[PDB]
Scaffold this active site. Structure first.
Site, short mmCIF file in Angstrom:
data_model
loop_
_atom_site.label_atom_id
_atom_site.label_comp_id
_atom_site.label_asym_id
_atom_site.label_seq_id
_atom_site.Cartn_x
_atom_site.Cartn_y
_atom_site.Cartn_z
CB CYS A 23 -20.53 -55.94 -27.49
SG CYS A 23 -19.37 -57.35 -27.44
CG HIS A 34 -19.79 -50.88 -26.69
ND1 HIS A 34 -18.96 -49.80 -26.50
CD2 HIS A 34 -19.37 -51.85 -25.84
CE1 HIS A 34 -18.08 -50.11 -25.56
NE2 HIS A 34 -18.31 -51.34 -25.16
CG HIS A 41 -34.80 -46.97 -17.73
ND1 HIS A 41 -34.45 -47.53 -18.94
CD2 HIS A 41 -35.05 -47.97 -16.87
CE1 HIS A 41 -34.50 -48.86 -18.79
NE2 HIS A 41 -34.86 -49.15 -17.55
C1 DHE Z 1 -37.65 -49.89 -20.71
C2 DHE Z 1 -37.83 -50.81 -19.48
C3 DHE Z 1 -38.86 -50.89 -18.63
C4 DHE Z 1 -40.19 -50.09 -18.68
C5 DHE Z 1 -41.30 -51.01 -19.24
C6 DHE Z 1 -42.64 -50.41 -19.53
O1 DHE Z 1 -42.78 -49.17 -19.36
O2 DHE Z 1 -43.58 -51.16 -19.93
C7 DHE Z 1 -38.55 -51.88 -17.63
C8 DHE Z 1 -39.39 -52.32 -16.62
C9 DHE Z 1 -39.21 -53.50 -15.91
C10 DHE Z 1 -40.14 -54.10 -14.99
C11 DHE Z 1 -41.45 -53.37 -14.64
C12 DHE Z 1 -41.95 -53.49 -13.25
C13 DHE Z 1 -43.13 -52.59 -12.93
O3 DHE Z 1 -43.58 -52.79 -11.79
O4 DHE Z 1 -43.50 -51.77 -13.80
C14 DHE Z 1 -39.65 -55.26 -14.57
C15 DHE Z 1 -40.24 -56.27 -13.55
C16 DHE Z 1 -38.37 -55.46 -15.25
C17 DHE Z 1 -37.53 -56.53 -15.00
C18 DHE Z 1 -36.20 -56.47 -15.29
N1 DHE Z 1 -35.58 -55.50 -16.04
FE1 DHE Z 1 -36.41 -53.92 -16.93
N2 DHE Z 1 -34.72 -53.58 -17.95
C19 DHE Z 1 -34.60 -52.80 -19.08
C20 DHE Z 1 -35.60 -52.01 -19.62
C21 DHE Z 1 -36.85 -51.79 -19.06
N3 DHE Z 1 -37.32 -52.44 -17.94
C22 DHE Z 1 -33.25 -52.90 -19.56
O5 DHE Z 1 -32.73 -52.18 -20.78
C23 DHE Z 1 -32.54 -53.53 -18.59
C24 DHE Z 1 -31.69 -52.40 -17.97
C25 DHE Z 1 -31.55 -54.55 -19.12
C26 DHE Z 1 -32.02 -55.59 -19.78
O6 DHE Z 1 -31.24 -56.58 -20.03
O7 DHE Z 1 -33.20 -55.74 -20.17
C27 DHE Z 1 -33.50 -54.14 -17.68
C28 DHE Z 1 -33.24 -55.05 -16.69
C29 DHE Z 1 -34.22 -55.74 -16.00
C30 DHE Z 1 -34.02 -56.91 -15.16
O8 DHE Z 1 -32.62 -57.47 -14.95
C31 DHE Z 1 -35.21 -57.47 -14.90
C32 DHE Z 1 -35.39 -57.59 -13.35
C33 DHE Z 1 -35.45 -58.84 -15.54
C34 DHE Z 1 -35.18 -58.95 -16.85
O9 DHE Z 1 -35.84 -59.71 -17.61
O10 DHE Z 1 -34.27 -58.34 -17.51
N4 DHE Z 1 -38.13 -54.35 -16.02
C1 HEC Z 2 -21.49 -52.53 -20.33
C2 HEC Z 2 -21.33 -53.07 -19.09
C3 HEC Z 2 -20.40 -52.97 -21.38
C4 HEC Z 2 -20.38 -54.14 -22.04
C5 HEC Z 2 -21.33 -55.34 -21.93
C6 HEC Z 2 -19.22 -54.08 -22.92
N1 HEC Z 2 -18.59 -52.85 -22.79
FE1 HEC Z 2 -16.99 -52.20 -23.80
N2 HEC Z 2 -16.99 -50.48 -22.76
C7 HEC Z 2 -17.93 -50.11 -21.81
C8 HEC Z 2 -17.58 -48.80 -21.31
C9 HEC Z 2 -18.42 -48.09 -20.23
C10 HEC Z 2 -16.47 -48.40 -21.93
C11 HEC Z 2 -15.68 -47.08 -21.77
C12 HEC Z 2 -14.21 -47.14 -21.38
C13 HEC Z 2 -13.96 -47.22 -19.90
O1 HEC Z 2 -13.00 -46.56 -19.42
O2 HEC Z 2 -14.76 -47.97 -19.27
C14 HEC Z 2 -16.07 -49.46 -22.84
C15 HEC Z 2 -14.98 -49.42 -23.68
C16 HEC Z 2 -14.69 -50.37 -24.64
C17 HEC Z 2 -13.59 -50.31 -25.58
C18 HEC Z 2 -12.58 -49.15 -25.63
C19 HEC Z 2 -13.07 -47.96 -26.48
C20 HEC Z 2 -12.29 -46.68 -26.23
O3 HEC Z 2 -11.52 -46.70 -25.24
O4 HEC Z 2 -12.51 -45.74 -27.04
C21 HEC Z 2 -13.67 -51.40 -26.36
C22 HEC Z 2 -12.75 -51.82 -27.53
C23 HEC Z 2 -14.81 -52.16 -25.93
N3 HEC Z 2 -15.42 -51.53 -24.85
C24 HEC Z 2 -15.21 -53.36 -26.47
C25 HEC Z 2 -16.22 -54.15 -25.99
C26 HEC Z 2 -16.57 -55.44 -26.51
C27 HEC Z 2 -15.87 -56.10 -27.72
C28 HEC Z 2 -17.57 -55.92 -25.75
C29 HEC Z 2 -18.27 -57.30 -25.95
C30 HEC Z 2 -17.38 -58.34 -25.63
C31 HEC Z 2 -17.87 -54.95 -24.74
N4 HEC Z 2 -17.04 -53.87 -24.91
C32 HEC Z 2 -18.87 -55.09 -23.79
C33 HEC Z 2 -19.00 -50.88 -21.41
C34 HEC Z 2 -19.32 -52.15 -21.84
#
Ligand code: DHE
Ligand code: HEC
Ligand code: DHE
Lengths: 434, 536
Positions: free
Chosen positions: B34, B38, B314
């Protein structure tokens, strides 16, 4: 604990007199540069007092327990901040000076300062808070909140996150268009460049924890500040933006205010501080070019009246160094001031003698045990004022001393003079003359 | 944070308590599933704030229903999908009504406790001792295995598989190309010496609980001097010695949002780049929308420039000249441009697309527009081009010059190389398998900027690898040192078959497929030369 951000500041922000509706020249006949702004602490007011005639020209409503008054670089605008975080800006050019703008910048605050770099006169004001841990840069004409910066962060030494790093003294550079911000608990001095608030340049200087107050040396180049709980003086070069020295004063809890700069007969240019925790006065050399062997070294330490000192004072035109003992538990000591003859100092290791001025006795107050606090000179540096601080329902006074003779010049009493504390001469505050 | 054992808080008036076991079960679920939306502190990020003041007003029934059924706006249907049992749904609803205990900080003491120097600098080689072509080596993440693979760029031989932190996010190289730095998603950093006869980790350190970025000092004269890592949790970055990983300076990123100027308690560090114009690191701070230029010439009297940009920063990259940093403020559909020479914001432009996601992006000289940088988008099929030449093509600078469709939505990475005439665009997160297992390739030489949409060739990368089993998703093009071949990862689950596909850039045909039982969940791939020099 509640936060206090831009929405909250803007809601509290009121411009009573817009800039375009203010005068374009002085419209009263007062001698503004010789005016004193005096805190009437528990009344939530300040008094504007004529430095020559001792007439109270006006009493103005402010935030509760104003901590200090500061002047814009042109001397036109008077800024005060209450301990509650309320800031008032007063236009001294009005026929009847009053608050032209106000704003609240936090829930607990002690410092405010104006921009003092040449070319930046009246451009900005900055306030620092104890709670939230933040500072805010405001427009110098309207108080509009322009840039709020959190001071939460890592301690300089242990590098651990600190959730409450209070802003203590704030000064203004004369060398660069920067504010000098002390961040207490993390032990960082921030040099904040106000030339661009969107692409904000800062220098975060690792110093010593427990930074509090301090002042610039005589040249206005070096900032010398007390890390009070660690008994150190930190020196930063405002021109080069770097720490230069950290030295132990040999005393307990240095508390300079802005300190006292003077030319010691043997040592050359020095800055002095007294201490809250003991009766000592310490001197640090402040002239790396002319007196390199003495620079940033503690050159002498000697006793004054007693512990509980808060403020030390002198002026370029005076041969005297005045030291209060405000917080001393003994009424006879807290009601008096020590005065050293700078011309007689030899720096031979002996303890310079001092004269004891019976300031509270001179004020003639029957009730209580009033505390004497904070010397402040007039513009000419010929007279020095002290507050005789008694309780809100008790008799207080200001005492004016003739600096040439060390004799009583005048006693200021008025029913409106409630709990007088800080006093700031317009000229000496706008120019950092101390 | 999920694996951390916590104390069950008591319940205040009008709230029911959870046992120690129930509360720890809920806490693990919160941080594993979550907090990514969140927030660690429950202050809200992509998902809404879930602090007790708000949730207690919503009430148990409301929380239980939202967690069970979700909503169309991006909140998963945990209960009806079966991801959470009925009992776990209730645990989460109850958990959200209880006071969150403070997540752990991670300062200098904790970093130094985790810091290990396996080979002191003095004991390492003084010259390359292996016979590898290091500049043509690729460092490939084996995500779910907590390893990286070092693969020869010409022979495609897996030279070694090294154990690192879990789910390495990226690999970065020191400016000299000797040291390889990797950072796991749990904050673990490993430094590898490529000059050893058998390269391995020479130093390691932990910099936080959750992290994604690492970078090396790239200003001329400062080669191998420093490394910097950024964390999601704690909100901080740390500058480390480039030879030992000793933590030298930790800076919190907690602070005020640039626009509303309100305190934000969890501003995650996103991309970190290194300036080639000044001895500075370039740090994206997501939630406050600030780009920090951090001068590493003096860590005691620390100079920084805090640039007000746009929230949701990002990823991003430097332009072809290495002067301007172009970064996506992804949820606001903007590209932010900063001049790293002057240290100031120069532009903020909407791409016309939904959720730009450039990676480091793709620089090329468009035949009619001049120098441009390209990005694709997660939220739609568009590719946008921004002009990057203020002196030589003034009217085109920092303007979106063209926007055209590629394979579909869900794109993550766009790529080119100065020796290539092709622009490659993936579609990794597309729901359609045919699209997610393919890449679009545009011919830069045929671009006319006449307003029409450039045609693209579709390369069936997953089909070329012979993988349909499970759910293969093709991700991220990366070129070899000569810019003659481009690699793609065929990312399948950890118990499924994955592959790397090497494409011949001149012919756009399949060159070679890399398969190995050790090649578990291959994701990011980084060529040493192209990463050390920022060639993209
Ligand atoms: C902050 C950030 C960077 C910049 C790095 C730097 O400047 O050194 C980045 C770059 C990257 C780059 C940089 C590629 C490049 O050519 O610079 C790669 C391969 C990569 C593979 C992935 N990223 Fe990334 N990535 C995140 C964050 C980031 N990723 C996440 O918060 C996100 C959205 C979700 C997560 O769970 O981590 C996410 C999902 C992914 C993927 O699903 C990828 C494909 C695989 C994985 O392990 O999560 N991220
Ligand atoms: C990203 C994909 C999410 C993950 C993983 C979880 N939540 Fe979430 N939640 C997300 C959003 C974008 C929103 C906004 C409401 C909408 O209309 O989409 C929410 C909302 C909730 C709420 C309601 C809060 C409110 O209406 O004020 C709850 C109680 C909540 N989410 C709980 C929750 C839990 C327990 C999670 C882990 C199991 C979880 N969320 C994952 C996005 C995302
Ligand atoms: C941070 C700070 C400054 C520097 C301001 C600046 O740079 O603009 C300062 C300066 C000052 C100055 C500046 C004098 C100067 O010449 O610069 C004065 C007069 C002053 C009168 C007092 N201060 Fe002060 N003071 C505090 C904080 C500060 N005081 C406290 O936290 C403290 C310890 C406790 C408190 O209750 O506020 C404290 C008690 C006092 C007093 O008891 C005084 C005498 C009256 C009062 O209202 O609290 N403080």
């Amino acid at each position: 604990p509640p936060e206090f951000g831009m929405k909250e500041m803007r809601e509290s922000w009121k411009v009573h007199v817009a800039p375009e509706d203010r005068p374009t020249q002085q419209e009263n006949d007062w001698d503004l540069e010789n005016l004193f702004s005096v805190t009437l602490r528990d009344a939530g007011q300040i008094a504007l007092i004529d430095g020559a005639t001792y007439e109270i020209k006006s009493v103005l409503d402010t935030g509760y327990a104003v901590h200090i008054s500061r002047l814009s670089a042109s001397g036109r605008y008077l800024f005060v901040i209450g301990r509650d975080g309320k800031v008032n800006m007063i236009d001294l050019w009005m026929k009847e000076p009053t608050t032209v703008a106000e704003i609240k910048i936090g829930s607990e605050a002690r410092s405010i300062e104006t921009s003092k770099m040449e070319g930046w006169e009246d451009k900005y004001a900055i306030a620092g808070a104890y709670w939230p841990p933040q500072y805010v840069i405001m427009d110098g004409e309207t108080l509009e909140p322009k840039k709020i910066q959190s001071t939460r962060g890592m301690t300089y030494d242990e590098q651990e996150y600190h959730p409450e790093p209070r802003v203590a003294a704030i000064l203004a550079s004369h060398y660069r268009p920067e504010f000098i911000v002390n961040v207490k608990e993390t032990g960082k001095i921030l040099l904040v460049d106000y030339t661009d608030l969107d692409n904000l340049k800062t220098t975060e200087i690792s110093a010593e924890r427990f930074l509090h107050d301090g002042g610039l040396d005589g040249s206005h180049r070096y900032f010398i500040t007390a890390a009070n709980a660690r008994n150190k003086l930190v020196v930063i070069d405002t021109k080069e933006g770097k720490l230069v020295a950290i030295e132990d004063t040999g005393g307990q809890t240095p508390h300079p205010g802005r300190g006292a700069n003077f030319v010691h007969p043997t040592f050359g240019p020095v800055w002095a501080t007294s201490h809250m925790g003991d009766d000592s006065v310490a001197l640090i050399g402040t002239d790396p070019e002319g007196h390199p062997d003495n620079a940033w070294k503690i050159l002498d330490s000697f006793p004054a009246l007693g512990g509980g000192s808060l403020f030390i004072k002198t002026h370029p035109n005076s041969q005297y160094l005045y030291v209060d003992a405000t917080l001393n538990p003994e009424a006879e000591i807290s009601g008096s001031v020590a005065v050293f003859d700078i011309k007689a100092m030899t720096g031979d290791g002996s303890d310079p003698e001092f004269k004891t001025l019976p300031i509270a006795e001179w004020a003639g107050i029957t009730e209580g045990q009033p505390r004497v606090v904070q010397g402040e000179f007039n513009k000419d540096g010929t007279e020095v004022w002290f507050s005789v601080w008694n309780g809100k329902d008790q008799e207080s006074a200001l005492v004016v001393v003739d600096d040439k003779t060390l004799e009583l010049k005048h006693v200021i009493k008025d029913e409106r003079l409630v709990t007088p504390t800080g006093k700031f001469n317009v000229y000496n505050t706008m120019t950092d003359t101390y």
